[PDB]
């Protein structure tokens, strides 16, 4: 039979309808008054969190992060530039807001490592994402066969090197075939043309 989780999931397919709609219209009011990064005791979207690796366990942390909506906040050129490079308004960043969120979170918790993140809505001027972080030093995690992998040294600052899930997707690594000639194994090894 359906899991209880499936209901949380099925409700979030349309955050603008039903009870969830009224829930958001309410939460966001408190959210808009919270800070850039807020640690929260429980995931707002349980199905999604667990689906992404979450676990009600010691060393597993979650924090909601809000980032501004829109294009790049860019400064107009202060020296000679050909028309092509004189833009300001339409320039957008190559890293998506969800990735900016994962990074701001990880910096808030210097000892933790980003495991994954998911969207929890947006109002007219900002987006909120809940990031799941892990304490690579807690034995509760060092002894977990499903998460201890994030304890290895080579997983340090994984979010800053785009090893996150949203990182790899944003790096154009989803497709294993056509279209990923300039993305795999890395953007940089491909001359940064991806």
């Amino acid at each position: 039979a359906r899991s209880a989780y499936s209901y949380i999931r099925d409700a979030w397919e349309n955050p603008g309808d039903g009870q969830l709609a009224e829930l958001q219209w309410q939460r966001q009011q408190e959210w808009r008054n919270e800070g850039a990064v807020e640690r929260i005791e429980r995931p707002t979207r349980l199905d999604k969190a667990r689906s992404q690796g979450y676990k009600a366990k010691q060393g597993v942390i979650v924090a909601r992060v809000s980032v501004r909506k829109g294009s790049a906040r860019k400064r107009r050129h202060k020296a000679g530039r050909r028309s092509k490079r004189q833009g300001v308004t339409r320039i957008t960043r190559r890293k998506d807001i969800q990735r900016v969120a994962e990074e701001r979170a990880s910096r808030t918790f210097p000892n933790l490592r980003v495991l994954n993140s998911y969207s929890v809505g947006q109002d007219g001027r900002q987006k909120w994402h809940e990031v799941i972080l892990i304490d690579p030093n807690h034995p509760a995690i060092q002894n977990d066969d499903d998460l201890s992998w994030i304890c290895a040294d080579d997983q340090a600052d994984r979010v800053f090197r785009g090893l996150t899930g949203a990182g790899r997707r944003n790096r154009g690594l989803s497709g294993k075939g056509k279209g990923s000639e300039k993305t795999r194994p890395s953007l940089r090894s491909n001359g940064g043309k991806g």
Binding site: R82, S83, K84, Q86, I91
Partner: protein
Amino acid sequence: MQMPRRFNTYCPHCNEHQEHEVEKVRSGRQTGMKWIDRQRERNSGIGNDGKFSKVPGGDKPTKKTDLKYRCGECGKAHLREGWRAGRLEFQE
């Protein structure tokens, strides 16, 4: 100059002389779906758009003759070289 609306002449399709009717080529309408149309949309961005930033040329003092010759029997038309003519009016 003046020009007969109809007259006998060679029909390249029938391969035999027949009465043709002369009409001025009316411009067909563009679809905006040709390859060039997609390149304009694709290649236009921030700053100058290269070729797509250029504007219409000018005019020659007199234009050449742009006509269609329709074979009165088979109904098929053919084109011919044109010649400079300040004005062209048909007779009947």
